[PDB]
Amino acid sequence: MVSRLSTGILDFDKLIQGGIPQGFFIALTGEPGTGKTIFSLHFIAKGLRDGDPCIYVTTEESRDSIIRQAKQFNWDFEEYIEKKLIIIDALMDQWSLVNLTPEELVNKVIEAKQKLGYGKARLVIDSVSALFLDKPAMARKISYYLKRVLNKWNFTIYATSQGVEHVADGIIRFRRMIRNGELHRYILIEKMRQTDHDKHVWEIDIVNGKGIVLKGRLEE
Ligand SMILES: [Zn+2]
Ligand SMILES: [Zn+2]
Ligand SMILES: [Zn+2]
Ligand SMILES: [Zn+2]
């Protein structure tokens, strides 16, 4: 039916008929510390292992932090750098963003894509909200532009945010909750075009050396 890219989490792929539709713009929404970056690292890790060109744009953390985080889950991004992976640091060389504007970000991503060569690509923009902190009302116009142009350049895109959702082809929501001294984390596919997606909230775990693990389905 459609060409789907694995999330890197098999149990999650089951929830969306094999994975994310190629060319989609996917909004990952939720409070800080809810697993959105890790979820994204899975997507890139899987792409890299698949031979996909991969680009990760980071606006809150350093490139090194992203790399260290990935190592936590037995992903080794270092030797892919400038070969099949470019991490663009919007928090701070040629793969840096001076100004956090939408066009500067796209131009830099396209520059990176030219370095990495032909082929379907994965892009993470973590986070897309950094683009409109000061222009909250531009969120929709910015996301439409980002989606149109990045899809044109053969990307399937994850965009984290802590109008984006409405422009997005899919929406995955992340939650955390403390109850009786316990932390519980949850994920929900709120929207996914062209996909008979699961509508249940799922409990997830973040496990060292593994990453996000689906623990079970919530009812009602
Ligand atoms: Zn570095
Ligand atoms: Zn729990
Ligand atoms: Zn739906
Ligand atoms: Zn049910």
mmCIF file of N, CA and C in Angstrom, residues 91-179:
data_model
loop_
_atom_site.group_PDB
_atom_site.id
_atom_site.type_symbol
_atom_site.label_atom_id
_atom_site.label_comp_id
_atom_site.label_asym_id
_atom_site.label_seq_id
_atom_site.Cartn_x
_atom_site.Cartn_y
_atom_site.Cartn_z
ATOM 1 N N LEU A 91 22.298 24.558 18.933
ATOM 2 C CA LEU A 91 22.652 25.089 20.254
ATOM 3 C C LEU A 91 24.146 25.409 20.304
ATOM 4 N N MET A 92 24.546 26.477 19.624
ATOM 5 C CA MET A 92 25.942 26.888 19.634
ATOM 6 C C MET A 92 26.311 27.584 18.325
ATOM 7 N N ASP A 93 29.960 22.619 13.236
ATOM 8 C CA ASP A 93 30.722 23.830 12.933
ATOM 9 C C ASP A 93 30.190 24.448 11.654
ATOM 10 N N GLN A 94 30.404 23.750 10.548
ATOM 11 C CA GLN A 94 29.700 24.087 9.331
ATOM 12 C C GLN A 94 28.320 23.466 9.487
ATOM 13 N N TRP A 95 28.227 22.505 10.399
ATOM 14 C CA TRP A 95 26.955 21.855 10.706
ATOM 15 C C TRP A 95 26.355 22.486 11.955
ATOM 16 N N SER A 96 26.481 23.798 12.024
ATOM 17 C CA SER A 96 25.880 24.565 13.092
ATOM 18 C C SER A 96 24.855 25.519 12.496
ATOM 19 N N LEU A 97 23.841 25.851 13.284
ATOM 20 C CA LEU A 97 22.919 26.923 12.930
ATOM 21 C C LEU A 97 23.249 28.190 13.706
ATOM 22 N N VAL A 98 23.623 29.235 12.978
ATOM 23 C CA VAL A 98 23.867 30.543 13.581
ATOM 24 C C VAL A 98 22.564 31.135 14.082
ATOM 25 N N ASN A 99 21.653 31.378 13.146
ATOM 26 C CA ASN A 99 20.320 31.853 13.491
ATOM 27 C C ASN A 99 19.306 30.728 13.392
ATOM 28 N N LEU A 100 18.472 30.621 14.414
ATOM 29 C CA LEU A 100 17.380 29.671 14.387
ATOM 30 C C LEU A 100 16.175 30.256 13.670
ATOM 31 N N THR A 101 16.255 30.289 12.345
ATOM 32 C CA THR A 101 15.107 30.614 11.507
ATOM 33 C C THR A 101 14.760 29.408 10.624
ATOM 34 N N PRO A 102 13.506 29.328 10.159
ATOM 35 C CA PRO A 102 13.079 28.196 9.358
ATOM 36 C C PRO A 102 13.894 28.012 8.086
ATOM 37 N N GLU A 103 14.199 29.102 7.393
ATOM 38 C CA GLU A 103 14.887 28.995 6.106
ATOM 39 C C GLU A 103 16.358 28.618 6.290
ATOM 40 N N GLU A 104 16.996 29.198 7.296
ATOM 41 C CA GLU A 104 18.365 28.835 7.612
ATOM 42 C C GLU A 104 18.448 27.347 7.927
ATOM 43 N N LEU A 105 17.437 26.835 8.631
ATOM 44 C CA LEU A 105 17.410 25.425 9.060
ATOM 45 C C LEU A 105 17.258 24.509 7.870
ATOM 46 N N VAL A 106 16.365 24.875 6.966
ATOM 47 C CA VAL A 106 16.135 24.067 5.770
ATOM 48 C C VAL A 106 17.376 24.085 4.861
ATOM 49 N N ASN A 107 17.937 25.269 4.656
ATOM 50 C CA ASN A 107 19.116 25.406 3.803
ATOM 51 C C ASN A 107 20.269 24.550 4.326
ATOM 52 N N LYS A 108 20.392 24.486 5.644
ATOM 53 C CA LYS A 108 21.476 23.734 6.261
ATOM 54 C C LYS A 108 21.200 22.242 6.132
ATOM 55 N N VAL A 109 19.931 21.882 6.203
ATOM 56 C CA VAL A 109 19.558 20.482 6.114
ATOM 57 C C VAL A 109 19.766 20.013 4.680
ATOM 58 N N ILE A 110 19.464 20.876 3.720
ATOM 59 C CA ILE A 110 19.633 20.519 2.322
ATOM 60 C C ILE A 110 21.116 20.425 1.993
ATOM 61 N N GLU A 111 21.901 21.342 2.555
ATOM 62 C CA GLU A 111 23.351 21.302 2.411
ATOM 63 C C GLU A 111 23.877 19.940 2.883
ATOM 64 N N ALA A 112 23.407 19.514 4.046
ATOM 65 C CA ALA A 112 23.827 18.246 4.625
ATOM 66 C C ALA A 112 23.413 17.101 3.720
ATOM 67 N N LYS A 113 22.214 17.190 3.152
ATOM 68 C CA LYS A 113 21.691 16.126 2.287
ATOM 69 C C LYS A 113 22.557 16.002 1.037
ATOM 70 N N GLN A 114 23.081 17.122 0.562
ATOM 71 C CA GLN A 114 23.939 17.107 -0.623
ATOM 72 C C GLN A 114 25.245 16.372 -0.314
ATOM 73 N N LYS A 115 25.676 16.447 0.936
ATOM 74 C CA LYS A 115 26.905 15.787 1.351
ATOM 75 C C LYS A 115 26.679 14.284 1.430
ATOM 76 N N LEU A 116 25.482 13.889 1.867
ATOM 77 C CA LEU A 116 25.194 12.483 2.166
ATOM 78 C C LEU A 116 24.718 11.667 0.959
ATOM 79 N N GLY A 117 24.310 12.348 -0.105
ATOM 80 C CA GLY A 117 24.022 11.672 -1.357
ATOM 81 C C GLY A 117 22.574 11.287 -1.586
ATOM 82 N N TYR A 118 22.329 10.692 -2.747
ATOM 83 C CA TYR A 118 20.988 10.294 -3.150
ATOM 84 C C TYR A 118 20.429 9.276 -2.162
ATOM 85 N N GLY A 119 19.111 9.274 -1.999
ATOM 86 C CA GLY A 119 18.429 8.238 -1.225
ATOM 87 C C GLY A 119 17.440 8.802 -0.227
ATOM 88 N N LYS A 120 16.367 8.062 0.033
ATOM 89 C CA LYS A 120 15.375 8.482 1.017
ATOM 90 C C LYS A 120 16.071 8.753 2.336
ATOM 91 N N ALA A 121 15.718 9.871 2.962
ATOM 92 C CA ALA A 121 16.404 10.332 4.160
ATOM 93 C C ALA A 121 15.473 10.447 5.370
ATOM 94 N N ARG A 122 16.077 10.368 6.540
ATOM 95 C CA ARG A 122 15.377 10.646 7.787
ATOM 96 C C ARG A 122 15.921 11.892 8.404
ATOM 97 N N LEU A 123 15.004 12.728 8.862
ATOM 98 C CA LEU A 123 15.330 13.969 9.521
ATOM 99 C C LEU A 123 14.609 14.061 10.863
ATOM 100 N N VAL A 124 15.349 14.420 11.894
ATOM 101 C CA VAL A 124 14.746 14.770 13.167
ATOM 102 C C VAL A 124 14.998 16.253 13.406
ATOM 103 N N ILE A 125 13.938 16.987 13.723
ATOM 104 C CA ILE A 125 14.072 18.381 14.170
ATOM 105 C C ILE A 125 13.642 18.435 15.624
ATOM 106 N N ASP A 126 14.627 18.498 16.509
ATOM 107 C CA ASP A 126 14.412 18.395 17.947
ATOM 108 C C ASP A 126 14.986 19.641 18.625
ATOM 109 N N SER A 127 14.187 20.687 18.820
ATOM 110 C CA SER A 127 12.760 20.669 18.553
ATOM 111 C C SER A 127 12.337 21.771 17.599
ATOM 112 N N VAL A 128 11.248 21.520 16.890
ATOM 113 C CA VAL A 128 10.715 22.465 15.918
ATOM 114 C C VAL A 128 10.136 23.732 16.572
ATOM 115 N N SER A 129 9.831 23.657 17.867
ATOM 116 C CA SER A 129 9.255 24.787 18.607
ATOM 117 C C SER A 129 10.251 25.920 18.800
ATOM 118 N N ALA A 130 11.529 25.574 18.739
ATOM 119 C CA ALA A 130 12.582 26.548 18.929
ATOM 120 C C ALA A 130 12.508 27.546 17.792
ATOM 121 N N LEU A 131 11.856 27.139 16.712
ATOM 122 C CA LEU A 131 11.725 27.999 15.547
ATOM 123 C C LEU A 131 10.710 29.105 15.778
ATOM 124 N N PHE A 132 9.792 28.910 16.722
ATOM 125 C CA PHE A 132 8.714 29.890 16.910
ATOM 126 C C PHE A 132 8.410 30.246 18.365
ATOM 127 N N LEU A 133 9.405 30.099 19.230
ATOM 128 C CA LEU A 133 9.271 30.533 20.617
ATOM 129 C C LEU A 133 8.790 31.971 20.667
ATOM 130 N N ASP A 134 9.377 32.819 19.825
ATOM 131 C CA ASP A 134 9.111 34.266 19.865
ATOM 132 C C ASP A 134 8.026 34.680 18.877
ATOM 133 N N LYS A 135 7.637 33.742 18.026
ATOM 134 C CA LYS A 135 6.621 33.993 17.011
ATOM 135 C C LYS A 135 5.607 32.866 17.020
ATOM 136 N N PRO A 136 4.968 32.641 18.176
ATOM 137 C CA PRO A 136 4.107 31.486 18.413
ATOM 138 C C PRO A 136 3.041 31.335 17.348
ATOM 139 N N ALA A 137 2.598 32.456 16.806
ATOM 140 C CA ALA A 137 1.485 32.467 15.868
ATOM 141 C C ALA A 137 1.928 32.052 14.462
ATOM 142 N N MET A 138 3.232 31.881 14.270
ATOM 143 C CA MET A 138 3.768 31.579 12.947
ATOM 144 C C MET A 138 3.940 30.081 12.819
ATOM 145 N N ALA A 139 3.648 29.381 13.906
ATOM 146 C CA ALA A 139 3.885 27.942 13.984
ATOM 147 C C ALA A 139 3.326 27.199 12.772
ATOM 148 N N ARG A 140 2.112 27.550 12.363
ATOM 149 C CA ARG A 140 1.446 26.831 11.272
ATOM 150 C C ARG A 140 2.102 27.134 9.925
ATOM 151 N N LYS A 141 2.354 28.410 9.668
ATOM 152 C CA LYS A 141 2.953 28.807 8.395
ATOM 153 C C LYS A 141 4.350 28.218 8.276
ATOM 154 N N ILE A 142 5.034 28.113 9.406
ATOM 155 C CA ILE A 142 6.398 27.599 9.426
ATOM 156 C C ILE A 142 6.396 26.095 9.193
ATOM 157 N N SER A 143 5.457 25.397 9.822
ATOM 158 C CA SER A 143 5.398 23.937 9.715
ATOM 159 C C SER A 143 4.991 23.510 8.307
ATOM 160 N N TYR A 144 4.126 24.293 7.674
ATOM 161 C CA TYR A 144 3.708 23.994 6.315
ATOM 162 C C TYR A 144 4.889 24.120 5.372
ATOM 163 N N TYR A 145 5.660 25.176 5.562
ATOM 164 C CA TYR A 145 6.828 25.413 4.740
ATOM 165 C C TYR A 145 7.808 24.278 4.926
ATOM 166 N N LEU A 146 8.065 23.956 6.182
ATOM 167 C CA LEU A 146 9.022 22.915 6.518
ATOM 168 C C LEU A 146 8.597 21.596 5.890
ATOM 169 N N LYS A 147 7.323 21.270 6.014
ATOM 170 C CA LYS A 147 6.809 20.017 5.495
ATOM 171 C C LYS A 147 6.930 19.970 3.968
ATOM 172 N N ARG A 148 6.430 21.004 3.307
ATOM 173 C CA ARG A 148 6.446 21.047 1.843
ATOM 174 C C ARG A 148 7.864 20.858 1.305
ATOM 175 N N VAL A 149 8.793 21.662 1.810
ATOM 176 C CA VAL A 149 10.134 21.711 1.248
ATOM 177 C C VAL A 149 10.955 20.482 1.612
ATOM 178 N N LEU A 150 10.787 19.993 2.831
ATOM 179 C CA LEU A 150 11.590 18.859 3.293
ATOM 180 C C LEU A 150 11.089 17.552 2.666
ATOM 181 N N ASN A 151 9.784 17.467 2.442
ATOM 182 C CA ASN A 151 9.222 16.321 1.739
ATOM 183 C C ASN A 151 9.743 16.312 0.300
ATOM 184 N N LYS A 152 9.796 17.496 -0.300
ATOM 185 C CA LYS A 152 10.304 17.655 -1.657
ATOM 186 C C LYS A 152 11.739 17.121 -1.768
ATOM 187 N N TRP A 153 12.506 17.257 -0.693
ATOM 188 C CA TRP A 153 13.902 16.820 -0.677
ATOM 189 C C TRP A 153 14.092 15.414 -0.121
ATOM 190 N N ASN A 154 13.026 14.633 -0.174
ATOM 191 C CA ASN A 154 13.072 13.199 0.090
ATOM 192 C C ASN A 154 13.252 12.838 1.550
ATOM 193 N N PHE A 155 12.738 13.677 2.441
ATOM 194 C CA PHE A 155 12.800 13.411 3.872
ATOM 195 C C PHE A 155 11.495 12.838 4.402
ATOM 196 N N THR A 156 11.644 11.987 5.416
ATOM 197 C CA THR A 156 10.575 11.607 6.319
ATOM 198 C C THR A 156 11.027 12.246 7.635
ATOM 199 N N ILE A 157 10.136 12.977 8.289
ATOM 200 C CA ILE A 157 10.538 13.940 9.322
ATOM 201 C C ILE A 157 9.833 13.702 10.649
ATOM 202 N N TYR A 158 10.618 13.699 11.729
ATOM 203 C CA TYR A 158 10.111 13.777 13.104
ATOM 204 C C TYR A 158 10.357 15.196 13.570
ATOM 205 N N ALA A 159 9.338 15.818 14.137
ATOM 206 C CA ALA A 159 9.475 17.163 14.679
ATOM 207 C C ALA A 159 8.974 17.171 16.123
ATOM 208 N N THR A 160 9.864 17.398 17.079
ATOM 209 C CA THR A 160 9.432 17.434 18.468
ATOM 210 C C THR A 160 8.978 18.831 18.840
ATOM 211 N N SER A 161 8.023 18.904 19.756
ATOM 212 C CA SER A 161 7.641 20.176 20.344
ATOM 213 C C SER A 161 7.291 19.991 21.802
ATOM 214 N N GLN A 162 7.800 20.901 22.629
ATOM 215 C CA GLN A 162 7.554 20.863 24.072
ATOM 216 C C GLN A 162 6.625 21.996 24.483
ATOM 217 N N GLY A 163 -0.111 24.814 15.740
ATOM 218 C CA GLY A 163 -0.419 24.513 14.342
ATOM 219 C C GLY A 163 0.453 23.400 13.783
ATOM 220 N N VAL A 164 1.507 23.054 14.515
ATOM 221 C CA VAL A 164 2.406 22.007 14.070
ATOM 222 C C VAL A 164 1.601 20.733 13.872
ATOM 223 N N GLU A 165 0.749 20.438 14.846
ATOM 224 C CA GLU A 165 0.039 19.166 14.888
ATOM 225 C C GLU A 165 -0.915 19.050 13.722
ATOM 226 N N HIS A 166 -1.486 20.178 13.324
ATOM 227 C CA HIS A 166 -2.520 20.173 12.296
ATOM 228 C C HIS A 166 -1.920 20.000 10.916
ATOM 229 N N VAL A 167 -0.688 20.462 10.754
ATOM 230 C CA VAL A 167 0.002 20.329 9.481
ATOM 231 C C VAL A 167 0.589 18.923 9.380
ATOM 232 N N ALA A 168 0.869 18.333 10.535
ATOM 233 C CA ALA A 168 1.501 17.012 10.594
ATOM 234 C C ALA A 168 0.615 15.909 10.035
ATOM 235 N N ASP A 169 1.276 14.936 9.417
ATOM 236 C CA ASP A 169 0.639 13.760 8.837
ATOM 237 C C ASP A 169 0.346 12.744 9.922
ATOM 238 N N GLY A 170 1.116 12.840 10.990
ATOM 239 C CA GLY A 170 0.941 11.952 12.127
ATOM 240 C C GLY A 170 1.282 12.670 13.403
ATOM 241 N N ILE A 171 0.703 12.210 14.504
ATOM 242 C CA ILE A 171 0.967 12.811 15.797
ATOM 243 C C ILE A 171 1.185 11.701 16.810
ATOM 244 N N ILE A 172 2.318 11.743 17.502
ATOM 245 C CA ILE A 172 2.543 10.802 18.602
ATOM 246 C C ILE A 172 2.777 11.599 19.867
ATOM 247 N N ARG A 173 1.976 11.293 20.878
ATOM 248 C CA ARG A 173 2.027 12.011 22.139
ATOM 249 C C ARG A 173 2.699 11.192 23.232
ATOM 250 N N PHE A 174 3.535 11.865 24.019
ATOM 251 C CA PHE A 174 4.313 11.248 25.096
ATOM 252 C C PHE A 174 3.923 11.855 26.435
ATOM 253 N N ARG A 175 3.691 10.997 27.424
ATOM 254 C CA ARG A 175 3.308 11.466 28.752
ATOM 255 C C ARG A 175 4.116 10.803 29.849
ATOM 256 N N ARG A 176 4.284 11.525 30.947
ATOM 257 C CA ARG A 176 4.860 10.947 32.156
ATOM 258 C C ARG A 176 3.993 11.307 33.347
ATOM 259 N N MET A 177 3.947 10.398 34.311
ATOM 260 C CA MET A 177 3.059 10.537 35.446
ATOM 261 C C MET A 177 3.706 9.896 36.658
ATOM 262 N N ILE A 178 3.695 10.598 37.786
ATOM 263 C CA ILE A 178 4.184 10.016 39.036
ATOM 264 C C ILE A 178 3.017 9.694 39.948
ATOM 265 N N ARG A 179 2.995 8.457 40.431
ATOM 266 C CA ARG A 179 1.934 7.983 41.304
ATOM 267 C C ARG A 179 2.495 6.956 42.290
#
